[PDB]
């Protein structure tokens, strides 16, 4: 019967600035709810949200992926590796009530794109046409990676997402954003001083800072610097592996390259498993609230 084929179908009657208005609604609520997570902002968790819903994709049978937008269910909401994402879902709930016509998938992904751009990151071209699957369909748990691993685990895991070394290290640059919460994952602390502003700091801190493998209050082992920062095992793997290392330094000295490659990879990630028709609209590039004079 062949693996499933998820075809993009534009929300009927909707065009470029139908979505640009949704972009703005998110960018606005971002600036308003600035108090969240001790003034970190909803930005990071929205980026995380777009990743964890895109990370359910499996290239082998085309199951999962952002096309579904199945995040409204029970079985993938209570995942141990997913705790804390509900703050992102509740953030989006009012704007989905505002635009009932938009699909769950297109919202979660747009929300992640809106977060990265408004946090002074690169422009991420976005596309539409994600459609909502039956309640019957929902990706099994354990589709998302584990933070207590090595570089081999990361490389191997990301193969399932059709990602190569360069794409992986790029996407990882996002762990400059926000922090780890002990009540959520069993890890605690940020990876840098600027965690609500998209920067290449992740690679910089990974090289210049002095890391010591410690034990936090959840009995989990993480890498801590005496400047206060922290790194997941999987993140520290990037400087243990030699092939990963050279890319880390590349992004540490070259931020525009990192931006350019993150944009590609992130768009790819959000657009995995969805096959776009050829009459389908060219990818959207929304302008920031700063570009609209706000």
């Amino acid at each position: 019967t062949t693996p499933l084929v998820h075809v993009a179908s534009v929300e009927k009657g909707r065009s470029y600035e139908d979505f640009q208005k949704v972009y703005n609604a998110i960018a606005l609520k971002l600036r308003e709810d600035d108090e969240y997570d001790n003034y970190i902002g909803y930005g990071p968790v929205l980026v995380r949200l777009a990743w964890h819903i895109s990370g359910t994709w499996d290239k082998h049978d085309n199951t999962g992926g952002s096309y579904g937008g199945t995040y409204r269910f029970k079985k993938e909401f209570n995942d141990p590796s997913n705790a804390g994402l509900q703050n992102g879902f509740k953030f989006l709930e009012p704007i989905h009530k505002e635009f009932p016509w938009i699909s769950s998938g297109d919202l979660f992904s747009l929300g992640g794109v809106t977060a990265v751009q408004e946090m002074q990151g690169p422009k991420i071209p976005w596309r539409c046409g994600r459609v909502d699957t039956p309640e019957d369909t929902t990706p099994d748990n354990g589709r998302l990676p584990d933070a207590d691993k090595d570089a081999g685990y990361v490389r191997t895991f990301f193969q399932r997402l059709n990602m190569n070394d360069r794409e992986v290290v790029a996407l990882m640059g996002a762990h400059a954003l926000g922090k780890t919460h002990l009540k959520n994952s069993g890890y605690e602390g940020p990876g840098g001083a600027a965690n609500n502003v998209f920067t290449n700091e992740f690679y910089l801190n990974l090289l210049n800072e002095d890391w010591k493998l410690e034990k936090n209050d959840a009995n989990n082992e993480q890498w801590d610097s005496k400047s206060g920062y922290m790194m997941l095992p999987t993140d520290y793997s990037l400087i243990q592996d030699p092939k990963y290392l050279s890319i880390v330094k590349e992004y540490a000295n070259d931020q525009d390259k990192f931006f350019k490659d993150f944009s590609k990879a992130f768009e790819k990630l959000l657009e995995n498993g969805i096959t776009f028709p050829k009459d389908a609209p060219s990818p959207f590039i929304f302008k920031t609230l700063e570009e609209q004079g706000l």
Binding site: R31, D34, Q120, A193, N196
Partner: protein, 108 residues
């Protein structure tokens, strides 16, 4: 005046969360990612040494008061293009007043 006075207890709860990671305010404060801010008011930009400023910060050499600081903290890149400070900005006016008021105290 342009900007009024706000809550110094609210300003202190704005500094611990949005500034303290890069900045120290107390006298003889250790230089972090950003320069020590003690006595920043009534001082030219890119002045306090021990820190390596980008030359864009020293480029326009402005005297820090209440009103010029407020817009610099609204959009650090718009007011000083090429600045090393990675900050989203204080888009809320009350948040600017509360913080500057606290900063005005701690810089003394």
């Amino acid at each position: 005046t342009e900007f009024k006075a706000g809550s110094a207890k609210k300003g202190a709860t704005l500094f611990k969360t949005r500034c303290l990671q890069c900045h120290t305010v107390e006298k003889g404060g250790p230089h972090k990612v950003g320069p020590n801010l003690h006595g920043i008011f009534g001082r030219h930009s890119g002045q306090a040494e021990g820190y390596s400023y980008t030359d864009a910060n020293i480029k326009k050499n402005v005297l820090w008061d209440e009103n010029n600081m407020s817009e610099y903290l609204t959009n650090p890149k718009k007011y000083i293009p090429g600045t090393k400070m990675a900050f989203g900005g204080l888009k809320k006016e009350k948040d600017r007043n509360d913080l500057i008021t606290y900063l005005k105290k701690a810089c003394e």
